[model samples]
Target: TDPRTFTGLSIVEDIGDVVPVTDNASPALPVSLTDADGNDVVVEDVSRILPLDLYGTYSKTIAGLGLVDNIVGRTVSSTEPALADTEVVTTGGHTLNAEAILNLHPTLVIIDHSIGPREVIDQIRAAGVATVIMSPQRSIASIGDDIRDIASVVGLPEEGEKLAERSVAEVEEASTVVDELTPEDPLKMVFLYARGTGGVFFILGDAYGGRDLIEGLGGVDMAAEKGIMDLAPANAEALAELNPDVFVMMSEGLVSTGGIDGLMERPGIAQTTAGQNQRVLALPDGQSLAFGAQTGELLLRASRELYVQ
Candidate 1:
């Protein structure tokens, strides 16, 4: 990787203050809840809720809980066409517009601690609004636990269970299709994040839900096998050495790399088997990395694209 590309590719450093949550244990809500920082919050009325995050996982988990109507505000990434009328409370991509959130007058705000600065959350709570912080987990299997946590906080635990069950069913169905359609030989796939001219370049490793999608479809995570942990700067020399059978990227990311032709031109890419064969696959931005209630559906779609031609 070029030194210039290394500027913002430090995933660990860039993701400062994101609380790592290992307890998938359910929360007892309508009770006093504590944030990762030990700030106590009590939310009584869950009618008007704001699920805010950079990758939209919090919002999606809200949707899974069948409480999209309860959402009064969202981050820019959560503003899907389905949520076209929702207020965007993030600027400069992931900065929280604290004023906009306060204006929403939400009864409770559920936030992923990974995105905005802690002060933004502090400001929200300081203004008398109840707030809860959730740590985003990258494992696809843990999404159900996340849903339950959100639902529990928002007073919808039952709905969370239903959604989780539905997700499992969807995963099984998708996995079956993958089992039926995938060739005897699995494809070695690697996920890369690119921001086109925005100058963001990184590899999505086994720790992310995207890697689960590849594995569920009987594809291998070449990057993970090569010992790349979490998101890391992609070294051309290493990628070429691994020589993945397929390069998977977010569709928007593909545009960032100037499409397949431009991607092929990247150093070490053309030297790989995938580059030589032009075996690159792109999934839509909203569905690619934002794992939530619809992960099974997203995985199914990706599996079909990868194996069913």
Candidate 2:
């Protein structure tokens, strides 16, 4: 058995479960946040409330939940309906934007565990600004939890809860499987993100959406050992090392380069046990990156298609 090892500042286990209402300070202005039902949620402070959503996944929901209107500045990656109307400087990664955020004169900044550099987060916090760091949601349930968590922080828990509940239910329903498989014939799967040129091949960790999907449907993850926070780029030699039965590939690379049909012609790729069995499952573009209820649906569809046999 090969033991996986990582050398980083600290290995991330999973997403954070923020405890709402830790402490509240006085605000410059009282703001009203309305929910989908048009219910108003009033908060004492809206000034200096900056949510720099570097990764645009949950950021979309945050904007839609009437929070983006209050946003002071966001990351370069956070492109959406709100971004088009706003003129804010972009922060390359959290590293390039501390000065930019300080210029915005924010009292609070929200961040996700997976996106920001910890050193940058610390620097921001050290400036006497309140920093809210959220964990990455590996599952549909956790995503809902994050929504509620953020809503509560901004004094909009009710709206947050309602949206969270709706999103969770949608994901649950979409990801459900009809005919349960017997233990004797479980699904075998592996998720890979590639950039062709044999650049890098990443296997999904146990704490990612793919991991959640596999575990949710009782399917087997061939790369359980890789786990989340451990998606290291592998060479062709490494690919042969981890010969997964069913290959779950990133949509763009596999598709634009002639899809799974041409993958067999690629050197070193066809040597895998999966290649021999022709079990490469190419994901559709955009769906894999969407961090909404759609993710759960994608997982369910993948399971039903791959496990038909």
Candidate 3:
């Protein structure tokens, strides 16, 4: 059930699941590749693996590569259901447990540096483990390269290429929906990062995957158009001037603000056309920004929520 002009807020609960790129993926071992961290490393093992990241991108990519069985442990934020029974290697939120990971006997560890203290990563490399660092700066356009990089390390470039094509094409296909439904003038959209009434509120500037998402959905990224290079404090006075046609937020952030009713209560929010129409779209916190295997799926679901009238 896609959200279509509800009274208040429209929330997307499901975006479908990632379909593994291959059925029987056998990694070619001892592959030498340049990691995202600019290290020339040789990965000789694929028997046991651990992928680390803040939003579960590493683990999710590993699962999408059809090598989830080789994974010894996963990051806490990884949303792949296949890895649900897998052991967790993080301590608090996204802190890697060096000792526990060592005990798991992983042959290779892929990281994007989204989750780490630097100390744990060094310790793992010191133990003669093959550690590959992937790019932390991911956007929908880079999904193919990201997947291909993972496959290169694990010896499945062919699979990665196929998956990459699918991922990019999927995003393009989903984008057509936005093109057809969105007005010719386009909807001016702003991305908001919020905790609750108590915590600080932020307008995502250039990073945090907001700009890419808004543009991918065929909406104008108000922050980018305004040249916001980094996080800018979201204030009622500022929002009233910014005045967007649609507001995009993580589901958790919307809920934290007490849903649509709670969000409109914020100062100056009620003055915008979006506020008047209560036009807000909230996607799952985990899937809202990560441009991994499900980038297209998330955008498709978001299109339904915002445009399927």
Alpha-carbon lDDT, every model: 0.69, 0.54, 0.80
lDDT for each residue of candidate 3 in 1-309, tens digit (9 for 90 to 100): 223234356788845446887789888877998887788889888889988776667666777788878888887666567777888888855688989889999899988766788899989999988898887557877888888888888898888888889888988888887777776677888998877785468888875768899988888888888888777787887687678888898887788888888888888778987888898889887677777778888888888778775
Q: Give the least accurate 10-residue stretch of model 2, judged by summed lDDT.
A: 1-10
Regions of model 3 farther than 4 Å from truth: 1-7, 90-92, 95-100
Writing each residue's lDDT as its tens digit, candidate 2 over 95-155 gives 4366777777766666665555666767776886666655545465687876776666565
Ranking by lDDT: 3, 1, 2
Residue pairs whose backbone atoms clash in candidate 3: none
Between prediction 1 and prediction 3, the one with superior lDDT is 3
Candidate 1 residues 1-309, lDDT tens each?
Answer: 111111111110111111212123233457567765667778787778888876667777766666666688877667455566888888876788889999999998888666787798889989989988887565667767777777677766677787766766766777788787666677777888887654477777765556676787678888768777677776687677678877778776677778887877777877777777777777766666676666666667766566543
* Each model's backbone clash number: 1, 6, 0
- Model 2 stretches astray by more than 4 angstroms: 1-57, 71-96, 99-107, 126-129, 178-184, 195-198, 207-209, 225-229, 252-267, 273-293, 300-309
Candidate 1 stretches greater than 4 Å from native: 1-31, 35-37
